[model samples]
Target: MAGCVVIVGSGVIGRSWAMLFASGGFQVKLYDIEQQQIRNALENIRKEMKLLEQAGSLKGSLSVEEQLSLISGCPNIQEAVEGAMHIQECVPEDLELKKKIFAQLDSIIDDRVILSSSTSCLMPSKLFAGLVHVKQCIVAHPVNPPYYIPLVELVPHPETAPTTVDRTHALMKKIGQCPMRVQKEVAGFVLNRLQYAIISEAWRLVEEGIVSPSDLDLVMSEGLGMRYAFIGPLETMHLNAEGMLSYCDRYSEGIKHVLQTFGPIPEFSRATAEKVNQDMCMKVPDDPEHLAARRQWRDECLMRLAKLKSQV
Candidate 1:
């Protein structure tokens, strides 16, 4: 069994962390300011874990009931957070609100525990600076549909202790998430940087009428994205030819030529985006129900892919 893990805020991210920690046999406390919020979080977890069980997607060796038994909802702020191996902040990405929570926790936490925030957009240094517990703080940013998507980016502030990173790395591995280290923080970190690069080029091509918006997605879903689920782009480059150097030697010029031909960054103007939106909305309407249905389907597909990946 793992150690105790405390989660602040009972939102979607908080619930996911609760489920994950419980699955890893941790005594997890899902915290919120209101008892009503805690009740909702528990009910939501019950539904999700049951759904996961029926889909054969529930994680870890424990049954749903056993995992459920490991989690408790905490309405008291102090009791919810103190004396845990780690604390994960899952509040919405509001700058002032997040800083306040960190500051509050800094006063309560000693050097024994690690503090982590779940945010896609905030930098660790910006969030952790001036805090008494800065050395124990880091960012453990997860992708959307986190229960199924196992990648968690671990970024540390400048004053963050080495043990904080390694300890987080160890705990993330223990919970079956892929943890990647950031030597130093950069805007958008690594994943979104690569994601943006691809998205920008895709947008440019669509804007130029070089490819239809719907077909552009297929080129990824049916092509690069398929292989990417298993091997990263760097490994693909290496294995595509003899090795990375040979691949670069053989195709660097052609790649450079193509890069040079890429158009300017898309402004994403309403007039320009109308065509793309129309195409996507045609396939899956933007109505709340329609969007939710597609997203649910996407998550299910990811669950199965996660299973297959584990096997291979």
Candidate 2:
């Protein structure tokens, strides 16, 4: 490991980031206000890493013990961040809380280290405003369970230096992540915007009685999602026909007509919620134990998919 990477929280995302940095052979220091949270997170990480090793899914060239040794909890934020190559803030999504943390960090950080956030929705403009080291601040939002899913959205504040974005991109790529640069900040960045589009349409379909909840999900899991793991919608468009221009000529009007037919945003509550819940419950109960178990299984499936993608 060349330099230490500091993770500023110990929740699920923080622990995942710690694992990723360690996987890249970067020494990682985890800092959290609550010692208990850090302790529990470390225990879980150790357990998960060992399981991943046994399944032959543990990333990087290092052995499990070797990787585990790279991560440790640091109680003092200032001391933890000293000389760190990167500091990732995995705190809660509240704007006030995030700003306060960044303010606290601004007072101690140097000019060189890139200050990044794991916020799924908050833009870098809102998070890094008026900071002393504003030019070094950026948003590096990783998909949940980043160990299996590699896409990281790298968003920059208006004042963020070009070198900051470049450094963050290089760091993500070095750790085997797919870092996509966002030219400007928009609500929901990119992933969630695309995700919400699908979700809203799915909600409309279920609400209108056009499809069952289970069948709606199969539309993705069995169809669109199958090839989405490898190619994006635009690429699919180009390949589906002779080329992008030919596809546009053939389907543009039909696409516009279908888009025009889409209903308004879903309210997503009341009777519709109950109906969706009932259908979902038939397959997987909403209890914490069952939900967690199902998520674990989903991660395993992704783990296998990641290996398959690597070969291709």
Candidate 3:
């Protein structure tokens, strides 16, 4: 890879970022405060890579040795960010710590380089609070296991330049990621907002006893989700109604009724929590020994799904 990415944490998100960059042929360096955390994360990431390789979804099917060459562990953030094309900070979601880190990163790294965060919720403008290169700092949040789930929500602040957004979009695309930028920064961008809308409705239905957890998951996983895998909501409606205008003319009122039936947000009750845990455990036992194998199985399924989507 021509560009270098510096990852500034060693937790799940950091390791996943490292894997994604390496898979795309970028040389990645990671920095962490705790040596033990670095060691454990490296082991976990290696285990994840092996599963991905077996599932045939890792970096153009490169052998494990080839993949390892692209990642390195550094002692500190300064060392990690030196000559980095992009700096990806994945520390905990602490505004104060983020401010401090960004302050330090802004002072030390190259002025032209992009500074990104894996923060899921924090507004980038707030995170880049006291930084000098405010326009270059933005939220480049990735979904978990970016090796399979390849969405990167690129949220840039008001001070951000149009060119910075375009460059970051190009960078993510080159690294084999599906990136979307929020023209106007919203609470959760696109995915999480849509996810919360569906989840809020699902919670209401479950609370009203209209459906059980097991049945709901089954309804989604076996039923509507498969169709969603092929087409998005608007196109699905266009296909169903013969045309877009006809669909709106026929179903707008009925859609309003269905939407109105959606009740308030459900409480996080103990009963529902226990029921969900019990059902999940029955499906997959709680034994730690079984987790590794189960994860490998899931990766295999994900690899097949990814391949299917590419052909779609």
- Whose TM-score is greatest here? 2
Model 1 per-residue lDDT at 228 = 98
Compared with the true structure, what per-residue lDDT tens digits does model 3 show for residues 143-215?
8767777789999888887778898898888778899878777887777898888887776666667887678
Residues 4-78, model 1: lDDT tens digits: 798898998999989888888889988886678889999999999999999998888999999999899877778
**Which pairs clash in the backbone of model 3?**
none
- Model 3: residues with Cα > 4 Å off, grouped in runs: 1-3, 43-47, 61-63, 275-296
lDDT of 1: 0.90
The TM-score between candidate 2 and the true structure equals 0.98
Q: Roughly what TM-score does model 3 have, to 2 decimal places?
A: 0.90
Task: For candidate 2, write residues 73-187 as lDDT tens digits.
Answer: 8989989989998999998889999999999999998888889999999978889989999999999999988999999999999999999999999999999999999999999
lDDT of each: 0.90, 0.92, 0.81
Those runs of model 2 whose alpha carbons end farther than 4 Å from true positions after fitting are none
Per-model TM-score on C-alpha atoms:
0.97, 0.98, 0.90
Q: Rank the candidates by TM-score, best first.
A: 2, 1, 3
